[PDB]
Design an enzyme around this catalytic site. Structure first.
Site, PDB file in Angstrom:
ATOM      1  N   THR A 100       0.697  -1.337   0.000  1.00 10.78           N
ATOM      2  CA  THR A 100       0.000   0.000   0.000  1.00 10.78           C
ATOM      3  C   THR A 100       0.713   1.368   0.000  1.00 10.78           C
ATOM      4  OG1 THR A 100      -1.700  -1.252   1.107  1.00 10.78           O
ATOM      5  CG2 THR A 100      -1.931   1.110   1.245  1.00 10.78           C
ATOM      6  N   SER A 101       0.114   2.298  -0.762  1.00  8.09           N
ATOM      7  CA  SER A 101       0.284   3.754  -0.575  1.00  8.09           C
ATOM      8  C   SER A 101      -1.085   4.403  -0.301  1.00  8.09           C
ATOM      9  CB  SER A 101       0.901   4.408  -1.816  1.00  8.09           C
ATOM     10  OG  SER A 101       1.954   3.626  -2.350  1.00  8.09           O
ATOM     11  N   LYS A 148      -9.440   0.391  -0.815  1.00  4.93           N
ATOM     12  CA  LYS A 148      -8.812   0.547   0.496  1.00  4.93           C
ATOM     13  C   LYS A 148      -9.436   1.683   1.308  1.00  4.93           C
ATOM     14  CE  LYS A 148      -4.496  -1.181  -1.422  1.00  4.93           C
ATOM     15  NZ  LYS A 148      -3.012  -1.105  -1.375  1.00  4.93           N
ATOM     16  N   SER A 199       3.489   1.161   2.669  1.00  5.72           N
ATOM     17  CA  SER A 199       4.861   0.937   2.194  1.00  5.72           C
ATOM     18  C   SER A 199       5.355   1.994   1.202  1.00  5.72           C
ATOM     19  CB  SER A 199       4.971  -0.446   1.549  1.00  5.72           C
ATOM     20  OG  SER A 199       4.031  -0.589   0.497  1.00  5.72           O
TER      21      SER A 199
END
Ligand SMILES: *[C@@](C)(CO)[C@](*)(O)[C@H](Cc1ccccc1)NC(=O)[C@H](Cc1ccc(OC)cc1)NC(=O)[C@H](C)NC(=O)CN1CCOCC1
Ligand SMILES: *[C@@](C)(CO)[C@](*)(O)[C@H](Cc1ccccc1)NC(=O)[C@H](Cc1ccc(OC)cc1)NC(=O)[C@H](C)NC(=O)CN1CCOCC1
Ligand SMILES: *[C@@](C)(CO)[C@](*)(O)[C@H](Cc1ccccc1)NC(=O)[C@H](Cc1ccc(OC)cc1)NC(=O)[C@H](C)NC(=O)CN1CCOCC1
Ligand SMILES: *[C@@](C)(CO)[C@](*)(O)[C@H](Cc1ccccc1)NC(=O)[C@H](Cc1ccc(OC)cc1)NC(=O)[C@H](C)NC(=O)CN1CCOCC1
Ligand SMILES: [Mg+2]
Ligand SMILES: [Mg+2]
Ligand SMILES: [Mg+2]
EC number: 3.4.25.1
Lengths: 195, 222, 212, 222, 196, 204, 233, 196, 195
Positions: E1-2, E33, E129
């Site tokens: 993820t960002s 998300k 991340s």
């Protein structure tokens, strides 16, 4: 602990059990009786982890004696062996299992037959003409395969047993200080004093 | 395993191969990986075989009781919610990887659940050891507004990709079509492209070949 | 494996089974575990098959080179010590061998040497080597006398392997018999346990533990 | 940490007749759950009427075959074009294998051909060089499936003469090349059914005094 | 993820990529998300998919029960419930959650909750991340009281860079706009953002 | 210390024409040491037969457990349990111990008394049902049994022919496994007669 | 004993009627960081061979130097270096295969998976694989890494066996390769959009295509996905 | 460390922070990570201080011996010598080196050499622990053929952000300008760069 | 291996060494001589790792015999013990050390005195009136502390030794199959056949 043997002949069951109790590099005792009388015609020998052995034997003994008083009746060797197996079968999945292996020699008075049961700490029961626990079996089973006959007398069984003890005394690494021999037949349980 | 799920015009279709393994050994050559949770909600299962069957039956049982309690046809999101909360509670130790699909009064649905309890939504999904072979086919040929017959073709093609290319998948293709307004049709062994060829020889032994020691009649009656 | 060899009035008896295992997988039932080094020397094999097979064959080559160089057949002591010194050089590397070098020479008479992969070398009258050695010992020891006849000694050796073949899961197949005299070794046949067991059971009346 | 070994699957099978010998092997090559090749031969004609196969880790297998083929070449150069007998080949291979006793070739090796009396010969090796001549040997991933079938059908194990009270064994006899190939084909189709690393194709090399002949058969590709 | 959430003049915007990974395999390339725990309180989920999901569902339940008794909860209240779950179960969770909501009194608010279960109220927050690669960019470019179009561009450019460098991030850029006007969903495809 | 291969043993079941066969070896050992050559692994509750391989203490325990359960079943239902139903009972009971399982490989065999259909089934230690038209295998020589069955088996064998096939399958498989053998028993099961035969096999 | 640092992902390839096609993306990953974007992982040797390399890039650059040196060494005292005694694909492969297996045997491997694609002097298609373990194999289609799991299934639908090769044209083959590269971009987390593709034909020779992009991608359906189950908004 | 090298119109500029750490303790806050291997070939050192030092000294020796025989070495040649050491001793080294030099033919050139010992020629390069935080910023802001003042600002702003987020980076920002004019050393103190 | 004892009395050194060779659960031999004559008036007993023991003993034997032939002279027990210690002291820092413990009993003809040296595998040398290696020492040292006198005869030393063997046979866990006893004095080395 270590050496426990059992031989079923025509009219009796004969149990031999080593006398040594060793701890570390010291033989603490050379006259230990590794057996308990569960009932007048049922004897159980035992070997395994220190403490566990006697604690388990006496616990079974107390239960069988309790049954005898309650019913005014002696449980058959088959019934006692099944009770013992189930206790070990429970034990193996406990928090701390009993690490005890047993032989149960009995004379069934209803059938007029001797019976020998071998049960390990997992609760693995088998009826046998001759049995052994631990490293003893690696010598005695092949020996008895050769010399054993199903119609032997108690005296022939004792000579057959002497042959096993001699082989073990010759080839076993440890000094087990001889054996206490006991006979189970129609007249109950008695000890051979000169072996 | 290889399992897939594909949405279409008026419903959803799921499919699966029929191989079961124990290490490198094929235990079952024709096992059923398509599971009925309710009449019109079906589940494809990959992972630990006993876990997928047990978890699908338990939730299926509770869904039936819920359906009777509420006097309503069960919903896919209810099965999805019950499955994921059960699987999450066991922290992945129940190794069930499921594709949940079905039709209900809300519409047609397609989800996937992982062993640790995470859920996905999609028009096309694939799980199991042959999911990469299947997903390659799905990514290549899938499109929006599929018909019933197109979705079955796409689904079975995705399973075939697993059958041929994945060693953990093989044998046959099972399909289940869940269309809105109709009964769900379970197509057991929809394709059977792995029939065993005729053996070269009959190994029927001459009677008396085996040496026997004892005979006895066994009493099964009272 | 179960292998034995014992000394007696009429020379040396050597008996071995014929099973090879890879875990619980029975790899072979027709394996040869005695290697004939020369007309007066035998070698028994127990442990790693390749280790035994390779190095005892090699031992035979060294024994041949001895008699070429010295114009005299190698002693049993010297032959065994070549093998023991070899495996000692490899000590720790992971060789697995339990071998018995059996043979006759003029200066020694009938002689048996136990040699294993940890470098142990022992002269003796009776040895049993292998996973089923204890089962063989049980029968062999309880029937052994020095004054056994060649006929009785051959049978006892055969019967001791049979005993171990039966009880030990990693022994079996067939029994290979040898008899070593002052005139050299004599082969006394391959005996399949498949037939031998029932033959022995019936004739001897033993093996009452088994369903007849 | 780097692991120098791998498992390329597949299985091989050698049977010896009276005046011939066969060495069969499937043509599938795998790693983990993926197929690398559907046709990658691992049974090779090494010259002097010797056929060889080293099944297991293919890199070690190919290395060994390459070294033995080269050993045959230098045997000719050094000993006046003398034919390398099957028994001499077997002993030579033991030394090749045992040479790497402490960093082994991860392969079950089988060679086949004719002995110096013209009779069929099969030799089989463990990974570190132990060897033995036999009538029969299966090797590789499906060896445990095929070998007991060969014991029964080639060496007639556990088969007694009907009506003889399990006293007279079924007598040993050589099989015809037609009968042997039937057993090979049935062995491999059976192995293909129950072992995931076996399939795709079967290649048999038959060795007679006339030379080395080949036969190919399709196997199931799932 | 960002993932990221950014406050601005009219409220707050949440932003996220759409990649879910199982190792180097992309299990889902169209993931959502950004999740609703209340009408105008949303969260961005990073870390374990199963953990963040189970938490969000419990929070959604808590806020639904809160609303039944005490009316609309504050964004701070929602963050406190997330914290309580994340902090008390810190040993068994891998969840990095950003909470973002719109009150009429408090306007836009962003709370970030890292692994430990601590709470941090910020003007904007980044996580996952891929956030490591845009700390420099976001610090230099963020301004308080931006417009809707400026904030959308700020998030779009930021996540575009995060996606470009992080292998664990990719797919589409989803966004959710929280204002007095209501709730607006936005999506942006690779062909647009990749060539920014 | 791998529970499933301490004692050793094998079970195999096959279907024929209006009949089923189930067979097992007699060995019970402690790793290399063979202890008993009378340890039967096939039991029956009414007309439903159950074979169990694996850790012997659990084999005994499960037999006693299923005898217990089928006896209460019969008292309440007032009829004998059928193979399909018993199969489900086995599966439930095994999965009940999901995270502390019985280390066993059970095999159900029998003929449904109502329909007359031959039925066989297999399980893993944890309860997964493995149904089959042809054959089920279990034990330490399962690989061997799989190979023997897959090659030797053909459909619709007569009871006398089926006996030869299943026996040869077991015997040759057992001879390639160190922990299996030491005698064997075969049950031939017809609609209303069951024949039990002890096989002569090599005793090593 | 090594661990790979900067890595390249899938290399995919297949045979067609007149030659072979091979492709690989231009990415140099540093773990999860997509570090380098101008990395060429297809390296031509002469005008009849292309070596595609995945895995460790430092080891790839070493292999480049070896191949570069092999060309130089082959030219020495060789009047037919550009004719009968030119480097064949089979020579280049066997050399690499030897090196790979020798390095694994010394417990110090070149951490790579390699596919040698080319056309022999007699017109025959050459396509063979080798990796860090020294394992070699050949097939009508070959792929490394994720390519093995996702590309091969797609490429095998076009050429499923030997007899399908004459029936497959360069147009059909290239289309399948380009499609496979798109699928890998959807699903491989260490792949990039930019890639190189090489065609070695027995008639038209070596055609090396640089700076290709994955295109015609389906992303529109993503707008319809909301939450992970119960969310309607 | 945070280090970078950037090519521009007149040549190339190398940049670095000045922090050396032993755990969370700063062993040296005024470190010089920009080191001379030749008159107009310099390198930035990241990773193990001892390893990078031992390598740079060997390279400096090699290029001094090269110059004695064959005259001025190319920047590519210098990078090749660094590679050779880093690649062949990859098991025993922890060194991330950026090589930057000025030729008159080739102008400014930058080569980066990561842990594995691979070589990568780039327009600009970033490395060290603090580089992770400025991938986004540097990609967005870098332009080819910048002026000296623009490149100095690009490096100063970049390293300022790297220093701000990375605990392993800090102190002063050193720079070295490589052009036809010669070699110029620049230094920038916290009071300037912190408030950019 | 296992039990090796040594007693120095007025005019001789007496070495006792167990006869058992055990491997696993089998006593392979019960008549093993765990000693080598290094020279006419020097005897060395040994115990330790299998293979290493005999290989080391025979290696030392060959070296001392080589010295004797070269110089036509017998090395003193002190000189032999120092040579042996140094070989073990080298060995302990080798790639694979000799895991062998030894007792060296000798009669110095120049001094007319018996001498007993105890050396372990590390190369730790001590001259003693009585010595033991392994677990034996845990019983015999205290026993000899009580019963030993420096002026005893060879016969008194043998009775003192019988007392040790009896204690070991009573309290040691393993059956070591008795001992071979050897006496080293002014007249050389001889074996007691009836012990
Ligand atoms: C494919 C075949 C996996 O290779 C599928 O996931 C398949 C799913 C399936 C579902 C319903 C009915 C049949 C098959 N799974 C299996 O076949 C599965 C593979 C597997 C083995 C071991 C595992 O442990 C982590 C997980 C998956 N096979 C089984 O479950 C077999 C029947 N059972 C066992 O091997 C017993 N295991 C269960 C898990 O606990 C250890 C022992
Ligand atoms: C009985 C069967 C118990 O093993 C015997 O010891 C038998 C001896 C023997 C000797 C010569 C010819 C045939 C048989 N030993 C074996 O059959 C042996 C058992 C064994 C396996 C591995 C060992 O290494 C620790 C030691 C003993 N079996 C084998 O050697 C089998 C055929 N081969 C392998 O297991 C191959 N391994 C060997 C070790 O290196 C890796 C490959
Ligand atoms: C990016 C992709 C990576 O960090 C995001 O954090 C992403 C967040 C996300 C994804 C989907 C829906 C909402 C939010 N996280 C993941 O994709 C996540 C990666 C991850 C896995 C495990 C972790 O520790 C427990 C931390 C991060 N992927 C998953 O959860 C997938 C569905 N499952 C697995 O990878 C299997 N896991 C289960 C947990 O144990 C390890 C193996
Ligand atoms: C930043 C600060 C952190 O990465 C830079 O990389 C910096 C680079 C530098 C420093 C001084 C001069 C030139 C270049 N590196 C360090 O400060 C470095 C951190 C580091 C230590 C060990 C590593 O693996 C071997 C990798 C990075 N610090 C040191 O080398 C200091 C002087 N020494 C120690 O920390 C002690 N080390 C010795 C090596 O083994 C571990 C303990
Ligand atoms: Mg497949
Ligand atoms: Mg046996
Ligand atoms: Mg700082």
């Amino acid at each position: 602990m270590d050496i426990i043997l059992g031989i079923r002949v025509q009219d009796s069951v004969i149990l031999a059990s080593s006398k040594a109790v060793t701890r570390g590099i010291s033989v603490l005792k050379d006259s230990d009786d590794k057996t308990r009388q569960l009932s007048p015609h049922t004897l159980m020998s035992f070997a395994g982890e220190a403490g566990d052995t006697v604690q388990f034997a006496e616990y079974i003994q107390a239960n069988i004696q309790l049954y005898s008083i309650r019913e005014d009746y002696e449980l058959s060797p088959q019934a006692v062996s099944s009770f013992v197996r189930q206790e070990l079968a429970k034990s193996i999945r406990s928090r701390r299992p009993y690490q005890v292996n047993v032989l149960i020699g009995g004379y069934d008075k209803k059938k007029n037959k001797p019976e020998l049961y071998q049960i390990d700490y997992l609760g693995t029961k088998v009826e046998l003409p001759y049995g052994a626990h631990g490293y003893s079996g690696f010598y005695t089973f092949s020996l008895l395969d050769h010399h054993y006959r199903p119609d032997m007398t108690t005296e022939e069984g004792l000579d057959l047993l002497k042959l096993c003890v001699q082989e073990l005394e010759k080839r076993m690494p440890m000094d087990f200080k001889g054996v206490i021999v006991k006979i189970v037949d129609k007249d109950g349980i008695r000890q051979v004093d000169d072996f | 395993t290889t399992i897939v799920g594909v949405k279409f015009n008026n419903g959803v279709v799921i499919a699966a191969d029929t191989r079961s393994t124990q290490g490198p050994i094929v235990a079952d050559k024709n096992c059923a990986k398509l599971h009925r949770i309710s009449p019109k909600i079906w589940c494809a299962g990959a992972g630990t075989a006993a876990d997928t069957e047990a978890v699908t039956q338990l939730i299926g049982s509770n869904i039936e009781l819920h359906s009777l309690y509420t006097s309503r046809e069960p919903r896919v999101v209810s099965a999805l919610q019950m499955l994921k909360q059960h699987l999450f509670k066991y922290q992945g130790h129940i190794g069930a990887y499921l594709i949940v699909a079905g039709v209900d009064p809300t519409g047609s649905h397609l989800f996937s659940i992982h062993a640790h309890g995470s859920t996905d939504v999609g028009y096309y999904l694939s799980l199991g050891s042959g999911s990469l072979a299947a997903m390659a086919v799905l990514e290549s040929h899938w499109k929006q507004d599929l018909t019933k017959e197109e979705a079955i073709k796409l689904a079975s093609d995705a399973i075939q990709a697993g059958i041929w290319n994945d060693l953990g998948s093989g044998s046959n293709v099972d399909v289940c079509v869940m269309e809105i307004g109709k009964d769900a049709e379970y197509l057991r062994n929809y394709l059977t492209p792995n029939v065993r060829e005729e053996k070269q020889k009959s190994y029927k032994f001459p009677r008396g070949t085996t040496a026997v020691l004892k005979e006895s009649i066994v009493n099964i009656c009272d | 494996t179960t292998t034995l060899a014992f000394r007696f009035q009429g020379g040396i008896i050597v008996a071995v089974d014929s099973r090879a295992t890879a875990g619980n997988w029975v790899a072979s039932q027709t394996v040869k575990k005695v290697i004939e080094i020369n007309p007066f020397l035998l070698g028994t094999m127990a442990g790693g098959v390749a280790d035994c097979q390779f190095w005892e064959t090699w031992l035979g080559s060294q024994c041949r080179l001895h008699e070429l160089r010295e114009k005299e057949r190698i002693s049993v002591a010297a032959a065994s010590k070549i093998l023991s010194n070899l495996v000692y050089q490899y000590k720790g590397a992971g060789l697995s061998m339990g071998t018995m070098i059996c043979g006759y020479t003029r200066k020694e008479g009938p002689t048996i040497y136990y040699v294993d992969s940890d470098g142990t070398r022992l002269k003796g009258d009776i040895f049993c080597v292998g996973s089923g050695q204890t089962f063989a010992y049980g029968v062999l020891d309880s029937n052994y006398k020095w004054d056994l006849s060649v006929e009785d000694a051959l049978y006892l050796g055969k019967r001791s392997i049979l005993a171990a073949a039966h009880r030990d899961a990693y022994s079996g197949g067939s029994v290979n018999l040898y008899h070593v005299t002052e005139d050299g070794w004599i082969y006394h046949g391959n005996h399949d346990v498949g037939e031998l067991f029932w033959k022995v059971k019936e004739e001897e009346g033993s093996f009452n533990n088994v369903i007849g | 940490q780097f692991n120098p070994y791998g498992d390329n699957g597949g299985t091989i099978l050698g049977i010896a007749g009276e005046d011939f010998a066969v060495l069969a092997g499937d043509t599938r090559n795998i790693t983990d759950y993926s197929i690398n090749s559907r046709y990658e031969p691992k049974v090779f004609d090494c010259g002097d009427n010797i056929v060889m196969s080293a099944n297991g880790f293919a890199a070690d297998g190919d290395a060994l075959v390459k070294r033995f083929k080269n050993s045959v070449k230098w045997y000719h150069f050094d000993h006046n074009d003398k034919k390398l007998s099957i028994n001499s080949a077997a002993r030579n291979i033991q030394h090749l294998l045992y040479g790497k006793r402490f960093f082994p070739y991860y392969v079950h090796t089988i060679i086949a051909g004719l002995d110096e009396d013209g009779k069929g010969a099969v030799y089989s090796f463990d990974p570190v060089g132990s060897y033995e001549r036999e009538q029969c040997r299966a090797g590789g991933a499906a060896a445990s499936l095929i070998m007991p079938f060969l014991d029964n059908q080639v060496n007639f194990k556990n088969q007694y003469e009907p009506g003889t009270n399990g006293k007279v064994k079924k007598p040993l006899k050589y099989l015809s090349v037609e009968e042997v190939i039937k057993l090979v084909r049935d062995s491999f189709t059976s192995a293909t059914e129950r072992h995931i690393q076996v399939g795709d194709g079967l290649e048999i090399l038959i060795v007679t005094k006339d030379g080395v002949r080949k036969e190919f058969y399709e196997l199931k590709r799932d | 993820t960002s993932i990221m959430a950014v406050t601005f003049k009219d409220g707050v915007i949440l932003g996220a990529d759409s990649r879910t990974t199982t190792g180097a395999y992309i299990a889902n390339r169209v993931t959502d998300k950004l999740t609703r725990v209340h009408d105008k309180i949303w969260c961005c989920r990073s870390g374990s998919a199963a953990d963040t999901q189970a938490i969000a569902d419990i929070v959604q339940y808590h806020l639904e029960l809160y609303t039944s008794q005490y009316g609309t909860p504050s964004t701070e209240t929602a963050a406190s419930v997330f914290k309580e779950l994340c902090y008390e179960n810190k040993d068994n969770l891998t969840a990095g959650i950003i909470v973002a909501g719109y009150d009429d009194k408090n306007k836009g608010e962003v709370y970030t909750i890292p692994l430990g279960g601590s709470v941090h109220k910020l003007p904007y927050a980044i996580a996952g991340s891929g956030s490591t690669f845009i700390y420099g960019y976001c610090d230099k470019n963020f301004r308080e009281n931006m417009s809707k179009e400026e904030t959308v561009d700020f998030i779009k450019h930021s996540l575009s860079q995060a996606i470009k460098w992080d292998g664990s991030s990719g797919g589409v850029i989803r966004m959710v706009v929280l204002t007095a006007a209501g709730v607006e969903r936005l999506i942006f495809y690779p062909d647009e953002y990749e060539q920014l | 210390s791998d529970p499933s291969s301490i004692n050793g043993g094998i079970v195999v079941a096959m279907t024929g024409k209006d009949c089923v066969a189930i067979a097992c070896d007699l060995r019970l050992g402690s790793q290399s040491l063979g202890v008993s050559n009378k340890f039967e692994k096939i039991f029956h509750y009414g007309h439903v037969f159950l074979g169990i391989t694996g850790l012997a203490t659990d084999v005994t325990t499960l037999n006693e457990m299923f005898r217990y359960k089928t006896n209460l079943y019969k008292l309440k239902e007032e009829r004998a349990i059928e193979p399909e139903t018993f199969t489900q009972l086995v599966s439930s009971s095994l999965y009940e111990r999901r995270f502390g399982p019985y280390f066993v490989g059970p095999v159900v065999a029998g003929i449904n008394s109502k329909s007359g259909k031959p039925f066989i089934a297999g399980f893993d230690l944890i309860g997964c049902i493995d149904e089959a038209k042809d054959f089920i295998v279990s034990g330490t020589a399962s690989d061997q049994l799989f190979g023997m069955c897959e090659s030797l088996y053909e459909p619709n064998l007569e009871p006398e022919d089926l006996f030869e096939t299943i026996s040869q399958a077991l015997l040759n498989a057992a001879d390639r496994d160190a922990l299996s053998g030491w005698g064997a028993v075969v049950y031939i099961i017809k609609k209303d007669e069951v024949v039990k035969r002890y096989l002569k096999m090599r005793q090593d | 004993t090594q661990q790979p640092i900067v890595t390249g992902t899938s290399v995919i390839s297949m045979k067609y009627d007149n030659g072979v096609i091979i492709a690989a993306d231009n990415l140099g990953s540093y773990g999860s960081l997509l570090r380098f974007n101008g990395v060429e992982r297809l390296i031509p040797v002469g005008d009849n061979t292309v070596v595609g390399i995945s895995g460790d890039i430092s080891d790839m650059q070493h292999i480049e130097r070896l191949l570069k040196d092999l060309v130089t060494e082959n030219a020495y005292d060789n009047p037919l270096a550009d004719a009968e005694e030119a480097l064949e694909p089979s020579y280049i492969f066997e050399y690499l295969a030897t090196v790979m297996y020798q390095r694994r045997s010394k417990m110090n491997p070149l951490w790579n998976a390699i596919i040698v694609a080319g056309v022999q002097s007699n017109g025959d298609q050459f396509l063979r694989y080798v990796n860090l373990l020294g394992v070699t194999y050949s097939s009508p289609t070959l792929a490394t890494g994720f390519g093995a799991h996702m590309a091969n299934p797609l490429l095998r639908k076009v050429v499923d066996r030997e007899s399908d090769i004459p029936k497959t044209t360069v147009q059909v083959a290239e289309e399948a390769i380009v499609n496979a590269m798109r699928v890998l971009y959807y699903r491989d987390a260490r792949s990039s959009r930019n890639f190189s593709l090489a065609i070695i034909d027995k008639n038209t020779g070596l055609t090396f295509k640089k700076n290709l992009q994955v295109e015609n991608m389906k992303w529109d359906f993503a707008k319809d996905i909301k939450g992970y189950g119960t969310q309607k908004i």
